[PDB]
Structure formats: C-alpha cells, structure tokens
Amino acid sequence: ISNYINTIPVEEQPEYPGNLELERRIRSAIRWNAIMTVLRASKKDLELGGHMASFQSSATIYDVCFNHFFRARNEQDGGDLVYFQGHISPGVYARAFLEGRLTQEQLDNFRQEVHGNGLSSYPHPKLMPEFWQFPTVSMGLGPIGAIYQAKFLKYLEHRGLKDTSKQTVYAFLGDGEMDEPESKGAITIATREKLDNLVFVINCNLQRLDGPVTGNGKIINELEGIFEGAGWNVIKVMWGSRWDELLRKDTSGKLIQLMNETVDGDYQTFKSKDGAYVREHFFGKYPETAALVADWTDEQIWALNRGGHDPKKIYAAFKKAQETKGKATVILAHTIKGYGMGDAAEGKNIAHQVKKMNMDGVRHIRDRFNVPVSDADIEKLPYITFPEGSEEHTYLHAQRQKLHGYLPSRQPNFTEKLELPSLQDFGALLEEQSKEISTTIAFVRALNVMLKNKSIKDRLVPIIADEARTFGMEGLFRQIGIYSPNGQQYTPQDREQVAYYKEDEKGQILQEGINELGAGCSWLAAATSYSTNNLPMIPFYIYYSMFGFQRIGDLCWAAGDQQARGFLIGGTSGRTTLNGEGLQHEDGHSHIQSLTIPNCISYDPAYAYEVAVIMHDGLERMYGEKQENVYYYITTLNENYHMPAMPEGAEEGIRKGIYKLETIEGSKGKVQLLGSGSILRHVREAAEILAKDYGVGSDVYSVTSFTELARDGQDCERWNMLHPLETPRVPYIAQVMNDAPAVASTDYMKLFAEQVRTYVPADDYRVLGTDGFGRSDSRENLRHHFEVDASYVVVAALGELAKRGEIDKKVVADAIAKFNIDADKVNPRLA
Amino acid sequence: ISNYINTIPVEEQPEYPGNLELERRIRSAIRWNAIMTVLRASKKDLELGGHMASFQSSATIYDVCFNHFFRARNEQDGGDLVYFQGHISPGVYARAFLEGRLTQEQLDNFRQEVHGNGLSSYPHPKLMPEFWQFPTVSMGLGPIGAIYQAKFLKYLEHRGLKDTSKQTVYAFLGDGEMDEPESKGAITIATREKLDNLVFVINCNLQRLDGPVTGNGKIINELEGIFEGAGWNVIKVMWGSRWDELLRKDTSGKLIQLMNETVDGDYQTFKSKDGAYVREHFFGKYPETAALVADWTDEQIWALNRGGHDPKKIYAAFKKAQETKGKATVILAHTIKGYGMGDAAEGKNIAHQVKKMNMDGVRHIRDRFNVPVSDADIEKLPYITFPEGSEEHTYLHAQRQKLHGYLPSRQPNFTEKLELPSLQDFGALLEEQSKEISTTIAFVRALNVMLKNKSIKDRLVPIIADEARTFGMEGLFRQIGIYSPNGQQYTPQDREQVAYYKEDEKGQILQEGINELGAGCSWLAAATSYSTNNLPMIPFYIYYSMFGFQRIGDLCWAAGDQQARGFLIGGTSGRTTLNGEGLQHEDGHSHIQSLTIPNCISYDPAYAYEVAVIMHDGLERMYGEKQENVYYYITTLNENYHMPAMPEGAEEGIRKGIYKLETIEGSKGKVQLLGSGSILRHVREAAEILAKDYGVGSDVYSVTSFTELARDGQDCERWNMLHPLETPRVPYIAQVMNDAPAVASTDYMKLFAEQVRTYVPADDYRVLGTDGFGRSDSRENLRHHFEVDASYVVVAALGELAKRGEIDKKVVADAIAKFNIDADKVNPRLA
Ligand SMILES: COP(=O)(O)[C@](C)(O)c1sc(CCOP(=O)(O)OP(=O)(O)O)c(C)[n+]1Cc1cnc(C)nc1N
Ligand SMILES: COP(=O)(O)[C@](C)(O)c1sc(CCOP(=O)(O)OP(=O)(O)O)c(C)[n+]1Cc1cnc(C)nc1N
Ligand SMILES: [Mg+2]
C-alpha cells in the first residue's frame, strides 16, 4: 500500500494525444443524452428504472478509452473485449446514438423491448444479438468472466489457432462490486498465466447502492494491497492536475499524511458539500495543510478534482497498462458518484437510486457541462446530435475509424463451414458392447472420435476442475496435453510410466483445478468464441454434476444470455449412483435446476448409444449449418453395466426424449414402465419380474429427456389454447405412449419425471424419485432407501392394477412383504 | 513474500508443552485406525470410497490441536468452532473411537449409514446430528463460512448478547481448495472486522487430486502474498527441526536462495525419491549447499522433515496465532501428501485416490509408525485400542479434559424458552390495509412487530446485501443501527437527516454489501447459533430473489445439512413484476430451485395478511417448543396493490398452501381459478370478466405454496402405495379444490403450478407461467408477453369449457380477438 496519491507522477505522465476541449464537447452531449433517455423513461411512470449517477462518475474514463484505446472488431481479430459496467448502459446507448448506430425512436424505447425497436436495461446479447456481447449486470461475474476470457485468448494464440496478441480484455467494475467473492477470488490466476492482455478498471467513487463501501476505511488502499499481493500491476488514479501544484509546494509532507489519514466516509462527504466545507474539514485539519490554500479562494478549493475525472491522468494509466508485460494491470480510478448532478445526487447516499429530477436539476446539468440546448428546448428533454460537417461529428468518427470502427457490436453466427463427424463415425458406440461400461466411458469415447475429426479436432476444448482421475481421463494428459503457457519448469513425478502429468504450452485440455466457476468461465469464453472471434471452438466441461448449476447457476444463466454453444457434462450423477459420497455429492436434482434455463438442452441417457446420438445431434444443431443458440447438459454415470445395441430407427426418439425400448408379453395385465439414466436397468428388471411372477406385460420406455418432453407438451398445450378452432396438437410423449397404467423411476427427485404428467396419455402415472438428502451406503442400499429399485417399481405397478380391480390388493400387500419393503419407514425426503 | 523458511525462528519458538514420545504413540494408533477403517471399507468392494493420503499429511497438525488448543463445548460457550477438512474424517473417526466415543461396529459401518449404526463419509450434521457441526466437503464453503462465523461471534459480543471472547474459529483447508473463488474472495473482511478470533490452517502438501496445485510455481508464496496483502498475519511452517542446524551454519545464504528458487513440482518429486536424489538434485545445485550435507549420510538427508510434520514447529505457530490481535492469522503448513505411505502414495500424483494397498503396503505403514500389531495379525486389519490405566489412555483423555472434553460434538436443540409474538400481535397486517402496499412492505411491517417483542427483539438479525433502499428499509439504519465493530469513524453525508447512514458497534443490522455469499454465510451463522452456542438468533436475510439459490445454492444446500433455522426473503421477485430490470434480474424460477432443498419451506404470498401468518408460523415452528429443523423461503414483491383483510379462519389454509378466496356465481358454466403472488389479483380480474362477460362462475383460490402442496401430495400417494389395504390419504389440495376445470397462473414458470397436477381433483388443469428469459418493459406489456394476464386466464378457462362442449369454440376465438392476443407470436420460452 502506497501513499494516497497517483501511482504515475506528472514527471512520468505522457502528453495527452487528443483535443481535450473538443472531446469535452462530445462527452457533454453523451452525458446529456444518457440523462435524457432515463428522464423520458421516468416520465412514462411505468417503473422502468435506469441509473444516472453511476455513468456520471465514470463517463470520462470510458471517453478516453473510446477516443484512444478501444479497438473494434476487425478483419484480423474480434478487437478489444470490453466488459462494460452493466448499469452505465444509458451512456453507451447515448454514444451509439451520437455515432448514428441507434435511432431516437430506440432511445425513446429504452427499457421497453417487447414490441421490438427498444433497448435492454443492461448488456444482454440474447436480447440485442448484434449489439451487446457480455452480460455484466450480475456483479462478480464480469471480473472473473474477463479473467478467463483473457486466459482463453492466450490459449488460442499458444495453440496456434488465432493471433489474438492485439486484443485487450477490459473489465469495468464498481468498487462495491469488488465485495463479491467472485471479483477478487481468482485474481492470482491472472498472475500465474501472466495475463498482460487483461485490464481491470475499478471505478472508485467510494459508494455502492445503500451508502459508502467502507466509510470507516479506504477501499482504494485495501484493493491496492490485495491486488499487489496477488502480483498485479496497480495504478492509482487519485487526483487531477489541479492538485499537482499544491502537492509540489508541500515540503512538510503534511498534505500527504492528511490524505492518508482521511477515510472514505469523510472524502465523499467532502464532495457532497462545497469549497467552504473542504477548507475547514480537510485542509483545516492541520495549520500546515491549511496554509497551502489560505491564498486560494473557496471556489478554487472546490475546483480540485479527483483523478478519475481528469482525461490526462486517465490516459497515463491506460497507456501504462497497454505497455506492461508479464502480468495484469488494475487501474483504481478515484471519482465522484453523481458527479455534476449537484442538488440531485452529487456525492449523496441516495445517488445510486436517482432516476428523476425537476427542471431545476435538468437546467443545472445543462449549465454545468455547457450542454448546447437552449431554454426553449430544455423542457422537451431533447436528445442532442452532431451534424455531418461539424467538428464534433468529424472528430467522433475519425477517432473511432482509426481504431477499426465502433463497439459494442456482435456477430451472431460464425462464417466458416465445419465438417462435423457423422453419426456413422460414432458407429462403434451404436453397437452392443462386449465389456460393461458406463455413460461416462461412452462420452470419453465420443470425445476421442471427435479428436479424430480433422475439421474440429483442434477446435475441441476439454475442461476439467481437477477430478480427471475420477473420470478415468488421466491418460488424456499425455495424449493431448494439459495447457500450460511456459509450462513444465520441472520433471513430472509421474514421468516414467504412461499416464504422466504432461503440461505443455500447446496442451489442449484446460485444467482449472478446484475451481468450478473458473472452469465455467473458461467454458463460456470457448463456447462463445464463434461469435466473439468468428472462430468456433467446442468446449466439453465434465465435472461432478452436483457442483454444476447448484454451484455456478448464476454463470450458467448468463451463459444462456451470452448464447453459449457448448457441452456441460455432469459426471458422477444420480443420487444413488455416486453411492459412497453422501449428502453434499449425491445429485438427484441438477436436472431440476437446469430446466430453468430456456436455451439449455438437458439429457439423462442410460446407454452408450444414446450418448453418441445426443452428442452428435448437439454438434449438428450448434456448430452445423443451423447454428442453433443453445447449449447442452448431459449427466453421465460412474456405474458399469451391459450396453445393448441401439434399436433400428431409434435416433429420432432419442433426440426427442423418449422411445419404446420393448414390449414384454403378459396375460394378467399391462403396464407402461419408464426409466432414465442408471435407474432404467432397474425398471427393466421390474418389467421382467412383473411378466415372470405376475403374468403382467408391459411397454418399456427409455426416457432420454423428461425435460425436452415436458417442454414439447407445454408447447402443444399452449398452441392448443391459442388455436381453439384447430385440431389439438399431440405432445410427442403422448404419441409414443399409450393409456395403460404407467410408472416411472429415475435417480432424480420425483418432479423430474412428474413434469410430463399433464402429457402422459394414461389414467395412472406413479412416479418414483430420489427426493431427500443423500447419504453414504452401497448402491443397493441407497436404491432401496430412496424407494426407486426394481422391487418398488413392481409394487407401484401392482398398486395401479389392484385399483382398477385387475388384481387383488392382497397381492400388492404380499409383494411388499415379499420384497422386504418397510412400509412404515420415514419418507426419504424427511430422512 | 518472505524467504522460504519458517516465520518463527527456533530462538523465538516456545518450549513444547506435551509428551512428544507418548503423543506420537497415540498419533500412530489413530493413523493406523484411520487406514484400517478405509481399507476394511474397500475390502467390501461396494464402491464405498474414502481417502488416506490426505489425513496422513495433516494428522500431526490436528494432533497438536487436539492435545493443546481445541476447546470443547462447555457450560459458558460452544468452545472452538472447528471446520474440519471434509475428507480427513476417517482420522477424526479414528480419534473418537480411541476416546471410546465410537464403537468398532460403527467404524466397520464407515460409509454405510442407511441402516443406523454407520458413519457419514464427511461432516454432515443432518446425518450425524450429535457429532458433526459444519459441512465442509464442498470445497470453498468452509473458508467463507468460517470467516462469517468469526464475524458473527464478534457481533454477539459487541451486541452484548454473549461473551464469545474465549472461542476461536479454526478453518482447516487444503491448498488445492484455495483455488475456489469463495476461498480467498472474502479474506479482506477478516481485516476490515479485525477477526483475531479466526485461524485459517492451510495444508500445503503441494498437491490436489489430479496432481500438484501449481507445479511450476510456489503456492505457499502465492498464498502468503495475497493474504499478507489482504492484511492477514501469515505464519509459514516450512521446515522441521532437523533443518535448523543447516540453516544456522549456512553462512553463504545459499540454502535460502536454493529453497526460494525451487518450484513446487520439484519439491513434490523430492519426497517421492530418496536421499541420494535430494543430495544431487537439491543440495547439489550449489557448491555451498552441497558442502552443508557433504558430511551427512543419504539416510540423514532423507530424514530432513517438513514443518507441518514437526509438533514443535506446529505448536509455535498456533501459540503465536493465539497471541495475535487486530487481525486474522493464516498458518501455511508444509506437508507431504501420502506421508509415510511410501511406495503406495508418498508424494505421488495418484496419492489422493489411494483407497487400498497390499500387505507390503500395510506392513510398511506398520513399520513406518511403529504400530503395535504383529506381522501375523496385519492380515486381519486390526483396530488398535488403549486399555484404561495405560499411559496412552490416561494422557489421551487427560489432554482433552483439560480442554473441556471432546470435539466434534453437537447439541441439536437450544435449551431456553422464548416468548414468541402471537399472531394477534400481527393483527394490523390481518386487517384490510389503508393504502395500497406490496408484500415487501408487509414484511418490513411484520419485522417491526417482532422488533417490539421483548423476548426476541434483540435476537433478530436483519441481513441485507446492499439493497435496503430498494426494500425501503433505509429507515432502520437509524432505528436499530448498522453493525460496525469499529463504530462510525466519520461524519456521514446525510448525518443531519432522518434515515441517515447510521453505523454502530451495537448496530443490529448486518450490511454485507454486494456480497450474496457473505450475507448468506452470515445468515447461516445466525441461523445455527441455537446449536453452536445454545443461543437462538433469528435471521431475516432479504435480497433480490434472482440472486438467491441461483447464485448461492451450494451454500443453501449446506445450510439444510447444517440444520439452519431462519428466513430467506426473496425481494423484487416475480418475472413480470420487476418489469424494467430485464434478463438477469427477472426471477420466475427461484421457487423451482428452492423446492430441491428438503428442509426449506417455500411460500409465494399475494397478500400482506398471508405474509404475517407465514412469518408467525415460521417463528413458532423453528423457534417455538417444536424446534423444527427447516428454514423458510418467502418471495415478496415491489408492486403496490389493494390488500384485503384476511378471511376469518383462513390461517391454517395459508400455512398449508391453499384456501378458497371466494366463489363467483355464473350460470353459463363453472371453473376453478388459482393464482399466486402478484398474479393472483389478475386471476381475480379474470374471474369477474368470466362472470360478467360470459356468465361463467368460478372458485377462486389463493395458492400461498404450490411446493408444500406438491410435497403433501407426494407424501399421500407414497403412503397409499405402501398401504394398499388401508384407507387412502387425501392430498390437502384435493380437500380444497373440486372437479370443475381449472386454470392456474403465477409469475413463475409453468412447472411451479404444474407440480401439483397429479393431486388436482379436476379433469382439466391448465397452467400459465413465465417460461423464458426476462426482458425490459412495463408490467402490463410483460404480463401479456409472458401470456399470464387476466385475458390469458379468461381464454384458458373458456377453452376448457368449449372443449367439454359447454361453450362454442367460436366464443374462445372471439375472446382472443377481443383481448388482442397474438395466437401466433413466438413461445415466450423461445423468445
Ligand atoms: C435494480 O438494479 P440495481 O439494484 O441498481 C443493480 C444494477 O442490479 C445493482 S447496482 C449495485 C451497486 C453497484 O455499486 P458499485 O459501487 O459496484 O458501482 P457504482 O458505484 O454504481 O459505480 C447493486 C447492489 N445492484 C444490485 C445487485 C446485487 N447483486 C448482484 C449480484 N448484482 C446486482 N446487480
Ligand atoms: C469424491 O471425493 P473427492 O473428489 O476426493 C472430494 C473429497 O470431493 C474432493 S477432494 C479434492 C481435492 C482436494 O485437494 P486439496 O489440496 O484441497 O486437499 P488435500 O491435498 O487432499 O489435503 C477435490 C477436487 N474433491 C472434489 C471436489 C470438487 N469440488 C468441490 C467444490 N468439492 C469437492 N469436494
Ligand atoms: Mg461505487
């Protein structure tokens, strides 16, 4: 932690390259327009929302970047990847409009998008596919997202996939946002990887939403201390040029001690008052600091500005960041929240929430920033524009043209044509297996086929969060290598034999250690590379399913917003299947969390051939000609068993979510039996017992996706309600199933199979599931405890028949005794 | 970063207090019993699992703590709160068995708990309510949890609630685990709040599961750098006592330079070779270092120990942390993964996964730690014990008794009786409200009722994540104060006004800034204080609902395991209600995530009187004589509308999940209409349209909890299936509803209401919901887009009647036209 002053002294400050006066004229119009869009929205009295005080404090920082730093997407690369602070979007819009990229009609539709021609509250690529690129409004996600983006850019360079050396990743953050564990929790990775292509820009206005971040302390110093400790290059932009003379004429070093000893709380209060206040409460603290300005006017005291508001001080920091190599840079910019809004919110605790202001307030910002709007127009909350030929218009576009154009901007589809493998290339996985394998083995095998596709082999991005040994993928390190930039500065302990720990700068797999959020962020950068850099990359992130959506659900939702196209493989899944691990490992609900995401396609395959068909279909939809903006989630298991051959013509049903595996004959009745994942074979066992011991036949179905089926049914019923005069549309599951009493069982909570109830064409539909906290035991004991094994499926099936009077209820009661079922033990959900 | 040697020099290290030789005998027995436990489990070949190499590397660190530091639960306080590393549990189980707290049968039932006399794989209070305290296996949660538990202990002391000055929080972490963002993402708070009652003990064995944490670097220095930068007191326990002579005679400074330059990957390998290897590859790097051991035998060189393995160095560290005030301490203990296991795993990349070994491997461990079991008995894998009267038994118990007993241990219920507020105490919220308010305002008013309760007023712990102004709670800052251990070291900006930003050391409100996980960890510490310190505290953590389970779900699952008893308030909930915010804010699925947690009770109330009845019921269930182990989740809204008085006698129905609001007459037909949260008033609007425009009457229901009704339903059919000869149980929802066609509509995705399909006693049950990504617009436009407003309800109900021939389908067709519904607009889920 250094003295409370600028890191870069004037003597080391490079000459500012732009026309400061002209840039202010432009900047004042962007400020004005941003405020007008929020005020107009406010006028509607529709509770639309919006912010003003935030962009006010950071506008000049962005302005200096727009005029001299931000490279836009171009012929060679995707340009600089800017993670704009979410709520300062009105200013981004204000600027795109001045640039002629947005219409006045669109600005008038700020936060009203349902009818088209409107604008999102914040950066949402799903909502504005050709404008926004990175969803940053959920605080914490932007910083770590950016860390891994820069990391991925260096990965494409090392792998010789693309020259990304001219791209800089910028994360624009709030000081309050740095409280999120995700914001600072991964900064040492930027050091390990020497990400000299990443720049963190923290707007240190000392305030968050409720009040000051740490009024009793100094966040700038705390930030400096930890980032410096993590090996980052820290640049403090504390004071503007007006302070430079006052600092040079302080031989007592008392001024510096003052600044050092003053805490955040008193600092923002200073700028919420007036010159007189600062004079007594700040400079007045010492008869030495007091003197320095005894000659200055109270108005010349108030004029002193913070570094984050001085283009000259801002530029020096960004220029320095740009030159620094070997490590990442973090710029801590000192600013005023609600800057220039005077009365309205300048340095006030309520500043964040301000979205309206009387004509007195509007007039103030007009005078304050010398906005060119006459008293005759002002009450009309007019947008300002610069006509062709004007210096403002000329300068604004020239500066952007020298930097390759305008941003943000997004390309929804990649251009190249990939020659994806055919289903036939996964042929061996479609046939009966000699050895008993698991669906996780099937996935690794499918990965290897892909690794053999000339077209995409190098575009595959296997990602692990430690746990590769659990998946039996350790042999892969030697095969394709673990990515390590300037890696392997030692000889692996594993060296001698076969599966050693091979780390190479050209290594293909991303090993992110015990860090699911970081692994997901790596997966996200890869999964959106197709748009960001017009370079399709296909990520396969396999990890313990329990630590997926449950642990990184917020990033998974942002991923959907970002239109990620990739594969999330939830390994060691199923509540009863990862039997010995217990409560915090046994996943019987990940599919419930995943169905909440609109563009995530989830599957719970039972067999190897289903995995192959599913993964093949996914590559096609996402990276084939269709370029479908969706990502996949497949749960795989760690249990081995017999893998039969795929039934002829079963492909469509597998992709849709269900197909009839077989029909067992029986003379005493007929039931329908559904199963998914690892529980399917137990449902097939119940089918044999029922036919063998009770003469009850059945239709057996493998349900590869209860969720895709429920979605289909939902779509059918929705269309039906909307087209009352049309013949009702039949949900796919109802087209496949019949009306005989049905029973389903899975390794997930009951809701997973119960979600298709409305669409099941049977009078009876009994669902068995693994509701309840997990615990350690054998797979058999867990399957009995969670009441999902063959014996429970048999009793559920007999129970439905008994009801219809097809069998005696004493027969059900005897089966319960026969199968050693304790009809009175606590509901596993409460266990 | 300091030199790569011990922080505490020998001349500064205290004299070891215990009997070293006797302590090692006991430690050797514990080591052996931990391994016999896992080995015997592997022999079962049931894929039970377990680890050995991890506890082997950290055993001595825990030993010193059990012998001289760990304070057990006592009559004055809960003692030291130890977050034991999860997978070193066999070691904690081995000690407990030696202390006679566990039986041989229980150890033999390791990881087989479904039948009652087994042991959980890891620390799970829900599974072993009287043994385990904190769930740590989900890596990263232990560290943040521990930080916020230490902060909470200081809070209880400052608030004058309880003297916790004698309790120390210990966080036992792995080094690979430190990569989780949540592991280091909140460490500066320990500095902000001067948590000198927290000790982080990081086991640096240089390896995680797949291999070394950072083979090409030095995590101990990386850890040191960032923690030191965060303001923590860092203590490095690098080398054992055998190194002292060498470091002392090393006059050239060469040994330190060498130790400083060697990277993790090489140090790891050193431990996997032998003395000759070390002599050549380590000391042999420099003529000066080479001369230091030139007179040593390879055997003597091989005996050189790592600090984390030396009791004397370990003790010196914990003793120093003990006297460090003003900040938290991190102990970085250098160890060997697979320590003493030799061949099978010592310093090997495969060490983590080792679950079994050959007789030569068991005999090696027997020799390595001088275990008293004959070469003949080893085959039997015998458990070692200390007979009463023996030195070991006496010493073992004597050390614990001096420290108040044994740990871990847990008290399931609190002992005191609180005088909870009655429901009549909330009578004001039960009457019709004067002005239109929201359910959030109802919650704030309800909180104030409790705040006037003599008994619990000061036991309340309101927690916010920098969103108090949004929830209109900024007025409480002044009323009860914002907790601030260091008081207010400045004059707030709004000081001169009411609702000024008041910070106080006696402040009740926990302001955790933009930090959901930290706020949730504070919530958890408060919500389990009843068990930990036998001091029931009742936390109400309110935040934007979208950032609840989605963002901190892993914590919420652990909270259920930890038997948390408190309230989670999801503010600004509902997809269409937080209209202007958009994609990453509009929550229409948090209830789908919340329903996955077994002991979390979820509600989505529409009216203020419902909020009151639910909170009061929650209060009595968790903190009343019942002491039920569940926590509550209640979604509240930011929309103001008319709040009617509660219908006489509706209390129980509100608690259960559904009650009939009213029935409107109509002779052209009859339907049932269900609504929840904010959409309920639109469902009522539809009931009037249906009646006055179409003559269709209806039964209107307020569904306060679809999830509780589904669970009750599942419990009925489960019980029924199990008792085929008994009187079937009737789901609660089927006791309120009838069989007329039904329509449900909520601000959540369809599944939220569809989950009760099986138990709805009606032929037709159409569900409307907010499936799909949110977008920015007015409430009216969104409710129409998400097809959930009154007009959609009318069309859904009319269509049901037309289908049954009750009405002409042309009537439905006309309605769609009359209400300006686009029957062909894209499915909101795909939009
Ligand atoms: C309704 O909008 P809002 O509350 O103003 C908004 C934009 O949603 C924000 S902005 C915000 C405060 C940000 O303050 P910072 O100091 O980081 O940034 P600034 O001072 O405004 O430059 C919080 C807590 N939240 C709420 C918030 C909380 N938690 C997460 C994870 N994301 C959020 N974004
Ligand atoms: C099946 O057991 P497991 O895989 O051995 C276990 C216990 O589940 C662990 S342990 C582990 C490695 C821990 O290595 P550390 O260096 O932190 O600890 P140690 O070296 O063993 O002392 C990982 C990645 N996981 C998996 C893991 C990953 N991510 C989270 C969030 N929690 C986990 N617990
Ligand atoms: Mg701020």
Ligand SMILES: [Mg+2]
């Ligand atoms: Mg380790």
